[PDB]
Amino acid sequence: PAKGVIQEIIGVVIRAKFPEDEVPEIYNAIEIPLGNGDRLVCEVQQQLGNGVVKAVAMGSTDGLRRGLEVIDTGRPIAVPVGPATLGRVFNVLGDPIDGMGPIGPEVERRPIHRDPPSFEEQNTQAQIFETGIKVIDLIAPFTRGGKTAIFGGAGVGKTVVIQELIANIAKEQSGFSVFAGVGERSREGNDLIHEMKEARIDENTTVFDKTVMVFGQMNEPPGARLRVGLTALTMAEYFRDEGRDILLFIDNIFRFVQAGSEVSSLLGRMPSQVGYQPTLGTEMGELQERITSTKRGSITSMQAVYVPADDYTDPAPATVFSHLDATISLERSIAERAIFPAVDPLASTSRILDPNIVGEEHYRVAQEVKRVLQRYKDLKDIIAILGMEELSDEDKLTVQRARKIELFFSQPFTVAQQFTGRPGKYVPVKKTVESFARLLNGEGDHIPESFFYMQGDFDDVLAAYEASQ
């Protein structure tokens, strides 16, 4: 239907002319036959004039000429939704890539471009979501049905924290999970995430058996990375709308943003700030507002956000920051100091860090830990050149407690046994609060700092110190 002709091919952007009365819609999908029986499913973005449209390739577009025919499908990119998508690995277009057979035509296909839930649908109910990580469960607690993100640089442990979260919480879900590997690098993803999700057993069913996986990896051209997040959100919204709880892990939202930036550069838009698209905020709103949990069902989102260089003032993470219920900041300085759960407690916040929601003692302990660390950060310049000896006795005690707290936030992970030769350790939120309260009370002042490195609760530190004696 509505057969047009390719006019221009600039990168992954294809400008195609169509008849005047049969111009494709704004987000319509158009297929280039490409020969060999396999199509290239471009997605329209703009209408330029007398049947002239601009589309994003969603594919290689590296060996196709001008003048090729383009068949307008008349509908946007439709991906399968339902129980048939559980235990399968999909593309940006919803085509399975695993060895299993294709999705049958009887399965409902939904467009990847849907309106976000309205204001009446929003669910503000918040409660603690225990993760087993001390720094996450204390400083920036997770919200069940709330949006949390793990910002970080390049060498910091973003994928390791995502893997540990999956290993800790995906065995007990009371629902389903969706993993959007947007620019995930395809080695630490399906080569590893899918392998470890088929090894974890939940009542004789693997975690992967109740997990949708959609992978717009780094090798893909910008269009696949630009729409794969929306594909995964469309697949998760079906389970959300029917009441099932959803655990959504989107890895490197910044890859989504970067793909959008490259497409906008090829689309001729005028750039903003450091080469970014003018429509950065609206694109971020379009993806992020569909992630929100509603009254029918809840999505507990855990996104990873790459930070270019180490610049947290970059427009992409800055736009991500305001779309979250919990923020975790990973710092290269902490990671280089071998505190590998390198969460910055002063730069990590959470909305449910309230004495009414999480508890009075939890709130008091977290705020006192942050206050001690802020005092340490203020005295860093004093300690750097004068040394510890010039500080007052209270300041010396505060700095020692802060160093012990910094070392104590480090925790051995089950998925990190190859790096640190220690077994994985799970610490409940109550044990985390009690251990940090005991550390702040004065217990452990006689213990040297090195016994707080890569331990569980305070009882593990005490046991190690008594073993050393």
Binding site: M270, P271, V274, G275, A384, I385, L386, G387, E389
Partner: protein, 48 residues
């Protein structure tokens, strides 16, 4: 003791000066790159 402590403080201050000079050079290069990129964007959007 004061002599030794102040010698150590002077050495640490020199190291901090070196690190801050590296940071300042990075900041200056980034500022000039941002300025020329903004000027080129504002000029190429109205001429060609």
């Amino acid at each position: 003791a004061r002599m030794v402590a102040m010698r150590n403080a002077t050495n640490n201050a020199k190291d901090l000066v070196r690190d801050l000079t590296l940071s300042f050079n990075k900041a200056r290069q980034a500022a000039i790159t941002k300025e020329v990129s903004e000027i080129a964007s504002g000029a190429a959007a109205l001429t060609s």
